[PDB]
Design a protein around this nucleic acid. Structure first.
Lengths: 170, 174, 54, 185
RNA sequence: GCAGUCAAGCGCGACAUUGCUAUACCGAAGCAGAAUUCGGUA
RNA sequence: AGCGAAACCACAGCCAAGGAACGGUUGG
RNA sequence: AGAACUGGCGAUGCGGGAUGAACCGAACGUAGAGUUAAGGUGCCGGAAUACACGCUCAUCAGACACAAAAGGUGUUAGUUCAUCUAGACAGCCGGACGGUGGCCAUGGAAGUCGGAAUCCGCUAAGGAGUGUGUAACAACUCACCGGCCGAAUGAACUA
């Protein structure tokens, strides 16, 4: 289960430079250690700050404001694969940011074969109104009075032998 | 992935459609036509007793192809039942006259002693032209195709030799 | 064997009744046949090279 | 993958035509809405060259309506939207020309049948049909045929026995800002 | 092979390109018939 | 009918893949 | 082929890997209870025909880095542009002109057997012409627009 963390670093302030830029970003990780490692990697890559002169001011966990509210999430993702790195944008209809990022990671590992090692979450934002969604598969669930069945349900059997010839009707 | 895609079929007052498991039956002035679609995996609904919907849920392009072709097949069946279909073929020969006797037998085609026979699956009626009419489009069309395909001019120039029977006109009986 | 006999016969009588429809159907089917050959078939390598050159 | 495998004008031409229509509306003494049916181009060019004081302003119907004014508030000129719902010549002369102008063109007519003209003239005067078009007579024409296939057959034989006349539904006055009913055919 | 133009991309680099050195059954051909040629199954 | 050996003898002759041609675990 | 430095072997059993010298863990007294590594959990084989998200019909798939640069009207996801309620793609109908049959070439070739430029007038739209076709005209036509049509469509690239 993923979790959202906030990490800030200001590169061990020295003489003549008190309170540096104080780089701030949000990191999604399953634990504090992984969040700190990802923050260090992002600082090394995007910025010129390394752990040699770095410092973790504070790490905090951010909880989604409305864990029971359905939202459409627009995520900008930059990931690396066998080919060169390129930007990517996707839209996810989920309830919480953590679930949306988890689904994005699962899709990337499934379709693009990209795993957590080479995936960067640039930004996660909520789409407020309809007709701003640019993906058809997300617009699919926005239709008014959406009703559909669940044909051919895969019923589970607790016994090897069943004297019923079960039907998959729903 | 499409959550639900549906196609509509009209039901004229002169015909009645009874729908059960995928087997489909049509009744009209010209007779009754029935077909089996248990391998197409589509569902039907009675929305207003005058229109028939065929829909597929959670089906992709592969399933959408069958979803759409179901409407075409049902429309073809309805048109055949209401009005029927007519097919015609032309007799062309250079030197050897072609004699056809109704099973349909072709004799004296390009001076060939062998008599080519095409079983009848559809009716035969009559200029030097044949007329084929039947409620089922598939039956009459296949009969015409078989009639055209038996007159193969083997080991001969295609352009120079024109003898044979070919499909010429298509339309409804009405 | 005159200067032009097949052409003269065609002009006098004409082409086959279904020549146009058959040719159009063959042209239409060639599109699917190209894909089938690409996904099928030394011969396959030669076909791929020819397609790339085209 | 697996898809259905001179240059186009574009929106710039539409904007230019809209501006030209606006200029014609605000410049020409009289404005007419020609609801003309299918017309042979010589007819249009003959009408254009008949008088040098008029311009045959045309374009997409929606584009022309927008220039005229699809709404009362969007009208380019007062009461112009009514016309939507280009000649400096005399109005009476223009309407007389519209009501009297007539041109030959390709139904109540009856045609009995081969030759190029279709047998409307003696065999000696007529010429045999070109054998290259023989497949057309069967595949499309299916072949008396008269007492869209009939129109196509008549056009193929070049039987221009019909006639066409320009029709206008309404006329608009530039300065007066009003629409006069002049339904003619 | 040598030497030059290439240039999707990454001074190197794609398709072209310039000087020497058996039987049987199907599809196509200007197949008029026969005969013949090219491709496929085997 | 009777008398009567010797060479040789760790283990031995139904076969399929691969364990330096090494050939002597999954199947038929 | 021959040399210089460096980690295992060699003197070495055990589990895993259909078996295994260059593979992983683990380096060893005889026993009982318990927890694990690599390796595994449909049967042979002791262990879930576990969960969740997507992908693939393969007529010799798949579960093992060279021949791999490219091809496919096979499929699922992304990037850059064009059109877009001034009417998106598509399907039908209509227009698709005048000098003109441009110049040369002419047994006849008028846009389409050939050679060289490609204009004006225009109209919402005509390449002195993208094709079928005739010894030449004839007839259809796409590109170019309009009308009937009603929402997203198209071109090129990446996974």
């Amino acid at each position: 289960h993923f979790k959202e963390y906030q990490v800030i670093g200001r590169r061990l302030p020295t003489e003549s430079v008190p309170e540096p830029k104080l780089f701030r970003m949000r990191i999604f990780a399953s634990n504090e250690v992984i969040a700190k490692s990802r923050y260090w990697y992002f600082l090394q890559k995007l910025h010129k700050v390394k752990k040699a002169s770095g410092e973790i001011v504070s790490i905090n966990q951010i909880n989604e404001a409305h864990p029971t509210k359905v939202k459409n999430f627009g995520v900008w993702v930059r990931y690396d694969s066998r080919s060169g790195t390129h930007n990517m944008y996707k839209e996810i209809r989920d309830v919480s940011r953590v679930a949306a990022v988890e689904t994005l990671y699962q899709d990337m590992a499934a379709r693009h074969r990209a795993r957590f090692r080479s995936i960067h979450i640039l930004k996660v934002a909520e789409i407020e109104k309809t007709a701003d969604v640019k993906r058809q598969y997300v617009k699919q669930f926005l239709t008014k009075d959406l009703k559909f069945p669940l044909p051919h349900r895969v019923q589970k059997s607790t016994k090897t032998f069943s004297y019923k010839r079960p039907s998959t009707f729903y | 992935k499409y959550i639900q895609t549906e196609q509509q079929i009209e039901v004229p007052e002169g015909v009645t459609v009874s729908i059960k498991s995928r087997i489909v039956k049509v009744v009209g002035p010209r007779g009754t036509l029935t077909k089996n679609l248990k391998h197409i995996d589509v569902t039907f609904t009675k929305v207003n007793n005058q229109l028939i919907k065929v829909a597929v849920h959670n089906g992709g392009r592969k399933h959408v192809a069958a979803l759409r072709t179901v409407k075409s097949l049902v429309d073809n069946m309805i048109t055949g039942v209401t009005k029927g279909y007519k097919y015609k073929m032309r007799y062309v020969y250079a030197h050897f006259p072609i004699n056809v006797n109704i099973f349909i037998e072709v004799r004296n085609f390009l001076g060939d002693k062998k008599i080519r026979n095409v079983p009848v699956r559809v009716t035969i009626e009559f200029k030097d032209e044949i007329v084929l009419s039947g409620n089922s489009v598939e039956d009459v069309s296949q009969n015409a195709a078989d009639l055209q395909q038996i007159c193969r001019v083997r080991n001969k120039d295609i352009r120079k030799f024109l003898d044979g029977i070919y499909v010429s006109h298509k339309g409804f009986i009405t | 064997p005159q200067n032009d006999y097949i052409e003269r016969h065609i002009k006098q009588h004409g082409k086959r009744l279904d020549h146009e429809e058959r040719k159009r159907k063959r042209e239409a089917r060639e599109s699917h046949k190209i894909s089938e050959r690409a996904q099928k078939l030394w011969k396959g390598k030669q076909f791929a090279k020819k397609r790339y050159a085209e | 993958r697996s898809k259905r495998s001179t240059d186009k004008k574009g929106r710039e031409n539409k904007e230019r035509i809209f501006d030209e229509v606006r200029e014609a509306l605000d410049t020409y003494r009289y404005v007419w809405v020609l609801h003309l049916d299918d017309v042979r181009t010589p007819v249009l060019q003959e009408i254009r060259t008949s008088w040098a004081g008029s311009k045959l302003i045309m374009g997409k119907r929606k584009v022309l309506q927008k220039a005229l004014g699809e709404k009362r508030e969007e009208e380019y000129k007062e009461n112009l939207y009514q016309l939507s719902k280009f000649t400096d010549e005399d109005v009476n002369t223009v309407k007389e020309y519209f009501k009297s102008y007539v041109r030959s063109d390709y139904a109540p007519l009856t045609f009995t049948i081969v030759y190029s003209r279709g047998g409307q003239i003696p065999a000696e005067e007529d010429v045999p049909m070109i054998h290259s078009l023989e497949p057309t007579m069967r595949n499309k024409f299916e072949i008396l045929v008269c007492t869209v296939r009939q129109a196509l057959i008549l056009k193929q034989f070049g039987i221009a026995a019909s006639e066409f006349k320009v029709k206008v539904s309404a006329y608009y006055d530039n300065d007066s800002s009003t629409v006069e009913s002049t339904n003619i055919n």
